[PDB]
Design a protein around this ligand. Structure first.
Ligand SMILES: Nc1ncnc2c1ncn2[C@@H]1O[C@H](COP(=O)(O)OP(=O)(O)OP(=O)(O)O)[C@@H](O)[C@H]1O
Ligand SMILES: [Mg+2]
Ligand SMILES: [Zn+2]
Lengths: 566, 222, 189, 595
């Protein structure tokens, strides 16, 4: 079943009613190991359950194989299971071999409903919903954000009729509409943290820390699904305005906590690096100036000279920069940026300050968390790598506590290192012209890079993919074409392919830009794997990322080009 | 003399602090500890009974936490007592061996403590007699000799300095001073000095001199 | 042996906190337990808890009060000595009397640390001001202790109105130095 | 007027700055006053966080506001330590970008700057005035002056008839402080193309004196100012803070600069069962093979233990290593690494050196016309290692000028009246080529070595590295070098240079093992056998051995044993170390002599 926006309180009350007894623990939470939104949502839920004294267990999980293993290994004393960041698309009842009869506790003929020992709650933002979980199952309870009621009526009707069943014509047309619904690609439509914050507001537990976590979760989608962030921004603005004290005339104190809405910028770690490095290592700036070649550096130096900022001053760190220029930055940027085409750098963001400490923005906090996740620190090696990433999850989780600031600083340093490495790898890719421009998609395979050990993590591979997507692909007035990025690792002799959705020119509101673009690589990849003896691993939660053997990539890509479903 | 559970806990804490700070091994409070252990068992049974059966959540938490606190206090008290018995094993054996001495271990120790004393003494004596003593001549073959160059039996540091708080009676020894406040008078024979111990004050005194006041409960070590 | 070497002859700061957390404190119940189950304790009195009424001052043990506050079911009423004005008065008293300690409670430091950590929204004065005042008082008392340590001797010594945490800090140095002085003196005779 | 407000502002920073629940500066001040260190180190990132306006003033006019922050510190210190003390020093820490030494120019005058360099000289401490008591010549009127050492002061010109300049200082009532002068040279890599390195004069006050020694890299925070000595001024830097990677204070005095937390790490590392392997692998990670030379370098860095007998005789405790071999062997690279890992080291070329360049030289002061002594390479490297490259190009006299400093560890001078015996306790690591460039096996060993027996006997271990063309080894080296060219373990198999250097310092200042009787009997038997082996070899060939085996080699074996024991913080040296020492001696010196 599915719980409407207003049923979150009912679901929370059910969880408290069932899995709350000081004798033993009866709650378990599974989290996507490499999703920041799920991390923040689970932190919010952990605080909420700590307040009410509910004993729980949190298990980081990478891939579906680990999910199946851990669910099989669960004890029978667990009354409620929480899945955050996955499970919506797959068939949980079929995948986990859940037989409703075995899990039934008591059945009432008069009520027409059955009671089950276990309950499974799905907190997923991906789409489309698997109609089996939403409408067929009862053990599975899915936290909806209105989609089922807004735009799933016809699918609901078709599925219910199909279960209910000259008739061949009706049956055919109903399976046809169901297949049409299943044919579309995958996309993210909302943020889980927003859902948990709505629950908290429903039960009245919203405070400043919860709002900070909600803002982090929501802003983690800004880079990819900007169209979700743009839709959720007004609610965050209203919440910040409502929670903030009216009077700010009071002076700073060692305990004062501030949460403002100041002008932010599309610059990489502006407040923890030089003004030069923020422009140099920015996706948008590199896209609009082509910094990977010497002409780009010359153009950036020209821009700085025109703005009236000495090169020595710009390269100085943020804290010690000359304060006249720091104060005038808003005026200097606004007249100068439009000329170089970097005008959209101007933006409004969230900045949080703890008394007498440096102020940090939401975007930089998310960047630090992601960097800690990525580089924080036959089948045996794969298991070891996944264990290391599960370990990094806890570093990133600790970095969310104000008592742990050294971890956040360590994350910022690692983020700067990682961005430098990604810049170098992208420069090497573009200089050699390794991108092949086929008619269905673009391809780029790395075979001998200098820093190829970095891209075994899906997060770092997606970072490089976003960098490439923005530069010389978003711009150049070329047709929108999806891109495939693959990388090799000699230690295991396999590829980590990763399809990437194209993105419209940033900050260009238009009717066509309003429409979202889906990711069809999951369907094509699964079809090809089923048809060919691929040996592909499709266990990753993001269905667009798989693993291939060294000698199968050429047949796989040939069949991909010949498929035409991309 | 039983009064109430609160008073029993208060005396338990008094004994715990005094034992922790005292240089000697104080007498064991047999009746208090018996009452406390019996109450612990009964309260554990009551908690289990209630648990076997949401407004009732907090009381159970409080009862369990209080049981943990009481168990911790008793645990630390007994552990300190055992350590002191370890340090002063030969001294207590000497007390028991002498018949003119008033103190007897059956009053100064519990059954568990006396069992520990005997067993550990036997074990250690076995070890040392195997390792070392069996090679020395018959003269140096005693683990408790006091007629040699150095005395082998360690006695408590009688004159150790201990912080005390004078809290008065819950009195013949009490008197008043020039300023009119109640006070106690004690003599330090080594220095021939007389020291005033006004009520409600903190002093760093020798243990020997204020030992009787501590025994009568007129002062409590901090 | 049975007892670690760092717990011999002295208490640890956690032991001092444990001792402090048994003193009564005043709370404002946010629930009405009084009837117009039941607490059953053995270490303290339970009549007060069984008789609670919303927004009615009552006294319970400090650890029970902290446990209740953790649940947002009671608001601890801070002691009267822990207001700004009272701390200013105590600071003045310390300043004008170089040879004596002020009459602060024997648990002012520990209770201040506990309440600042746990109950930050139950004070009627800004927390930063109270922290500053307590810091100032601590510095003055530290100066006085340093000056008074020059009178250690083979006889008694008196440190009136010195709190529990300060005495715990100073217990090893004072006791051992005075013990050595006594040993030398006794050897003299 | 404004001065009192500025002082009030800096006093509120020291009394109100908390990052969590601890007052960092109030507590730092109390703890410093308790040990008699009248100063406060403030991090400028914390001041930019309290009030950015206070930082704007301290950076806009540094020599006017710094004197007003010192008096605020003094007032707070009096309030905190005295129940109703010279002016307190302010030491600054900053993370601003470092300006290259040669980029300092007119645009940085009277501003706070951060820079790095190498200290080449330090002066004898002078005395500067901080509180003068004065009197008048004629009317005998008493007054006082107060001086801060921040220049943009002189005695009053007119009395308070009395002629010009009527005041004379009363010295027995005045107070003074300490002042030192330092010369800072820019780092060799920073220097521009075809330019000699440039110097800069620096001065430090009070608690920043005697903090550095010549030849140590430092980072400096200070004020770039000018003093008149026509319309030009000679620039200099007024130090406000010194940061160095070398614990010079620990090295000159006792063991210091190691935190208990840092000390715990060193003990844990010493407890590692295979620390020897880790240290051997940590030296020159980018040079393939040559394991024996790397073990020898570990032993040389560790050093032996020195003994002073009751009669006064001193026994050398340092190890000297010679590397003779064919070109391309990576001897120079090993020397350049050893210069970089050792806490104190000097890299010198035998060709570009001289007898006075090494040891010490006599110089005349142009002003006082008085001769004084300046230390050379072996004095500048005292307590460390000297890397003499191109040891064969050195002239006979310049090489002869090294015997006493290599063996007796002293530099006797008798020149221009100056008569002394300096101290030079250094380890020599030398690299050389044979006579013909390549060690030619056809000719006798006495033909490939021009070094005399006296100089050679002073080396503990002699390595005759020969380059043999073996296809397997050649392929391995090619693969390793190509990997280096096209291409971080740090997993218990290698430790960075900084950690290794700190560990060397700790071991040197913490341990000095001694031989047990079994080791003594073993080493004594081995010496008798080796001497017999040289005699059997000599009887066979009319020629007298070119590589000697004297008592110095026995002492060298003892030193190697003691260094191996010291490597693991073992107070006693057992046979397990004697065997390794004998193996190394056989692998280097007996190997060289056998040929
Ligand atoms: N493992 C290695 N073995 C030998 N040479 C190496 C090795 N790795 C690098 N090199 C190269 O060695 C060169 C340095 O010369 P090297 O130190 O070997 O000379 P040398 O034999 O000590 O001196 P000379 O040839 O004057 O006798 C550098 O070019 C470095 O690239
Ligand atoms: Mg060379
Ligand atoms: Zn005059």
């Amino acid at each position: 079943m599915y719980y409407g926006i207003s049923q979150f309180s009912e679901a929370y009350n059910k969880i408290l009613r069932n899995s709350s007894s000081h004798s033993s623990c009866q709650l378990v939470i599974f989290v996507s190991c490499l999703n920041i939104d799920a991390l923040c949502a689970t932190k919010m839920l952990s605080l909420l359950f700590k307040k009410q004294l509910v004993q729980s267990q949190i298990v980081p999980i990478f891939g579906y194989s680990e999910l199946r293993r851990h669910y099989s290994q669960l004890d029978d004393n667990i009354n409620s299971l929480l899945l955050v960041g996955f499970g919506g698309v797959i068939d949980l009842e079929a995948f986990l071999e859940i037989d409703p009869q075995e899990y039934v506790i008591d059945t009432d003929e008069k009520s027409g409903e059955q009671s089950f020992r276990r309950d499974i709650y799905v907190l997923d933002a991906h789409r489309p919903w698997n109609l089996d979980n939403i409408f067929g199952s009862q053990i599975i309870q899915c936290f909806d954000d209105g989609t089922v009621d807004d735009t799933l009526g016809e699918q609901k009707e078709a599925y219910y009729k199909l279960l209910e069943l000259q008739r061949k014509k009706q049956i055919h047309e109903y399976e046809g509409v169901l297949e049409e619904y299943y044919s579309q690609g995958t996309t993210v439509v909302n943020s889980i943290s927003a859902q948990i914050y709505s629950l908290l507001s429903a039960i009245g537990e919203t405070n400043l820390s919860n709002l900070w976590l909600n803002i982090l979760g929501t802003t983690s989608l800004d880079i990819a699904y900007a169209q979700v962030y743009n839709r959720l921004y007004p609610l965050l603005q209203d919440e910040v305005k409502r929670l903030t004290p009216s009077s700010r005339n009071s002076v700073k104190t060692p305990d004062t906590l501030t949460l403002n809405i100041q002008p932010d910028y599309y610059l990489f770690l502006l407040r923890h690096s030089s003004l030069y490095d923020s422009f140099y290592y920015s996706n948008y700036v590199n896209a609009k100036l082509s910094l990977w070649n010497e002409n780009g550096k010359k153009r950036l130096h020209k821009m700085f000279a025109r703005m009236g900022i000495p090169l020595s001053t710009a390269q100085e760190t943020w804290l010690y920069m000359d304060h006249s220029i720091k104060r005038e930055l808003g005026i200097i940027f606004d007249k100068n940026l439009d000329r170089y085409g970097l005008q959209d750098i101007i933006r409004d963001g969230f900045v949080r300050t703890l008394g007498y400490r440096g102020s940090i923005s939401a975007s930089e906090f998310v960047e630090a968390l992601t960097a800690l996740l990525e580089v924080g620190n036959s089948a045996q090696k794969l298991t070891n790598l996944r264990k290391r990433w599960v370990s990094n999850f806890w570093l990133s989780w600790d970095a969310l506590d104000d008592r742990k600031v050294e971890l956040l600083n360590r994350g910022i340093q690692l983020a700067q290192d990682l961005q430098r490495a990604i810049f170098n790898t992208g420069v090497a890719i573009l200089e050699k012209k390794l991108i092949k421009h086929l008619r269905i998609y673009r391809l780029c395979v790395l075979q001998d890079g200098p820093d190829l050990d970095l891209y075994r993590n899906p997060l770092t591979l997606l970072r490089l993919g976003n960098w490439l997507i923005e530069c010389c692909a978003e711009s150049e007035d070329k047709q929108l074409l999806p891109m495939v990025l693959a990388s090799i690792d000699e230690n295991t002799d396999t590829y980590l392919v990763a399809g990437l959705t194209p993105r419209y020119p940033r900050g260009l509101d238009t009717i066509h830009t309003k429409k979202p673009i889906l990711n069809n690589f999951s369907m094509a990849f699964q079809q090809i794997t089923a048809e060919t003896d691929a040996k592909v691993r499709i266990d990753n939660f993001e269905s667009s990322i798989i693993e291939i053997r060294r000698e199968d990539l050429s047949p796989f890509l040939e069949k991909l080009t010949l498929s035409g479903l991309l | 003399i039983y009064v109430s559970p609160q008073q029993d806990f208060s005396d338990l804490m008094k004994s715990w602090k005094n034992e922790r700070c005292s240089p000697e091994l104080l007498p064991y409070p047999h009746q208090l500890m018996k009452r406390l252990l019996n109450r612990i068992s009964m309260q554990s049974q009551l908690i289990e009974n209630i648990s076997m059966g949401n407004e009732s959540k907090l009381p159970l938490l409080c009862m369990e936490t209080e049981l943990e606190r009481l168990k911790f206090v008793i645990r630390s008290y007994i552990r300190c007592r055992l350590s002191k018995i370890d340090k002063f094993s030969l001294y207590l054996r000497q007390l028991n061996e002498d018949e003119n001495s008033l103190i007897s271990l059956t009053d100064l120790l519990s059954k568990d403590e006396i069992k520990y004393h005997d067993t550990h003494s036997l074990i250690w004596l076995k070890l040392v007699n195997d390792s070392i003593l069996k090679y020395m001549p018959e003269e140096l073959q005693a683990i408790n000799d006091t007629e040699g160059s150095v005395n082998m039996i360690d006695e408590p540091d009688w004159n150790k300095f201990v912080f005390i708080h004078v809290n008065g009676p819950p009195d013949p020894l009490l008197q008043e001073n020039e300023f009119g406040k109640p006070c106690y008078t004690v003599t330090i024979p080594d220095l021939k000095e007389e020291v005033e111990l006004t009520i409600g004050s903190i002093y760093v005194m020798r243990y020997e001199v204020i030992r009787d006041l501590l025994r009568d409960d007129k002062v409590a070590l901090i | 042996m049975s007892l670690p070497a760092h717990l011999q002859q002295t208490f640890s700061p956690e032991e001092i906190q444990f001792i402090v957390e048994n003193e009564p404190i005043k709370i404002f119940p946010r629930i009405t337990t009084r009837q117009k189950t039941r607490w059953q304790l053995i270490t303290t009195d339970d009549k007060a808890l069984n008789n609670m009424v919303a927004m009615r001052s009552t006294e319970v043990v400090l650890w029970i009060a902290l446990l209740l506050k953790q649940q947002s079911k009671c608001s601890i009423v801070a002691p009267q000595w822990l207001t700004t004005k009272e701390l200013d008065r105590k600071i003045q008293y310390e300043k004008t009397h170089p040879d004596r300690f002020s009459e602060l409670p024997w648990n002012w430091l520990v209770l201040a640390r506990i309440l600042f950590n746990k109950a930050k929204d139950d004070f009627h004065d800004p927390i930063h001001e109270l922290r500053g005042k307590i810091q100032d008082l601590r510095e003055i008392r530290q100066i006085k202790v340093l000056k008074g340590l020059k009178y250690l001797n083979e006889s008694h010594l008196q440190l009136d109105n010195l709190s529990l945490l300060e005495i715990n800090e100073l217990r090893p140095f004072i006791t051992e130095i005075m013990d050595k002085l006594r040993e030398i003196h006794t050897a003299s005779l | 007027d404004d001065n009192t407000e500025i002082i009030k502002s800096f006093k509120n920073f020291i009394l109100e700055f908390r990052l969590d629940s601890q007052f960092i500066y109030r507590d730092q001040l109390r703890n410093n006053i308790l040990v008699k260190n009248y100063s406060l180190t403030v991090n400028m990132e914390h001041l930019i966080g309290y009030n950015e306006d206070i930082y704007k003033k301290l950076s806009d006019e540094p020599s006017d506001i710094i004197p007003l922050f010192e008096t605020a510190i003094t007032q707070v210190a009096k309030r905190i330590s005295i129940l109703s003390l010279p002016t307190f020093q302010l030491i600054l820490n900053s993370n601003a970008n470092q300006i290259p030494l040669r980029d300092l120019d007119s645009e940085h005058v009277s501003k706070i700057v951060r820079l790095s360099g190498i200290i080449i000289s330090t002066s004898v401490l002078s005395s500067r005035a901080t509180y003068l008591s004065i009197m008048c010549r004629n009317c005998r009127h008493t007054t006082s002056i107060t001086i801060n050492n921040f220049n943009s002061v002189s005695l009053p010109r007119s009395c308070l008839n009395c002629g010009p300049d009527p005041y004379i200082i009363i010295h027995e009532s005045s107070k003074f402080i300490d002042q030192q002068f330092l010369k800072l040279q820019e780092i060799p890599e920073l220097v521009p193309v075809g330019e000699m390195p440039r110097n800069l004069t620096m001065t430090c006050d009070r608690y920043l004196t005697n903090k550095v020694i010549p030849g140590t890299r430092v980072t400096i925070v200070g004020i770039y100012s000018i003093y008149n000595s026509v319309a030009i001024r000679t620039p200099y830097i007024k130090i406000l803070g010194i940061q160095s990677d070398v614990e010079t204070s620990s090295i000159w005095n006792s063991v210091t600069m190691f935190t208990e937390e840092e000390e715990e790490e060193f003990l844990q590392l010493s407890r590692n069962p295979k620390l020897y392997e880790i240290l051997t692998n940590s030296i020159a990670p980018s040079i393939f093979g040559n394991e024996d030379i790397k073990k020898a370098i570990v032993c040389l860095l560790m050093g032996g233990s020195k003994k002073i007998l009751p009669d006064g005789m001193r026994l050398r405790g340092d190890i000297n290593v010679l590397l003779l071999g064919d070109p391309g062997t990576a001897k120079s690279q090993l020397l350049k690494f050893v210069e970089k890992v050792s806490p104190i080291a000097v890299y010198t070329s035998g060709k570009g050196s001289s007898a006075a360049g090494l040891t010490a030289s006599v110089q005349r002061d142009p002003m006082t016309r008085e001769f004084y002594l300046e230390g050379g390479a072996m004095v500048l490297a005292d307590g460390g290692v000297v890397c003499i490259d191109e040891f064969d190009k050195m002239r006979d006299e310049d090489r002869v000028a090294i015997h006493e400093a290599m063996e007796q560890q002293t530099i006797s001078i008798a020149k221009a009246g100056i008569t002394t015996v300096l101290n030079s306790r250094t380890s020599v690591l030398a690299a050389a080529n044979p006579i013909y460039g390549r060690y030619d096996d056809l000719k006798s060993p006495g033909d490939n070595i021009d070094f005399q027996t006296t100089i050679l006997s002073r080396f503990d271990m002699i390595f005759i590295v020969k380059d043999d063309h073996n296809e397997e080894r050649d392929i391995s080296i090619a693969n390793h070098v190509i990997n280096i060219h096209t291409g971080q373990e740090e997993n218990g198999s290698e430790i960075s240079i900084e950690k290794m250097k700190r560990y060397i310092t700790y071991c040197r200042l913490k341990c000095a093992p001694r031989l047990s009787p079994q080791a003594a009997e073993k080493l004594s038997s081995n010496f008798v056998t080796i001497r017999k082996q040289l005699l059997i070899n000599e009887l066979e060939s009319t020629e007298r051995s070119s590589i000697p085996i004297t008592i110095r080699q026995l002492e060298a074996i003892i030193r190697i044993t003691e260094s191996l024991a010291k490597l693991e913080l073992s107070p006693i040296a057992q046979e397990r170390h004697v065997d390794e020492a004998i193996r190394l001696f056989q692998a280097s010196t007996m190997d060289a002599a056998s040929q």
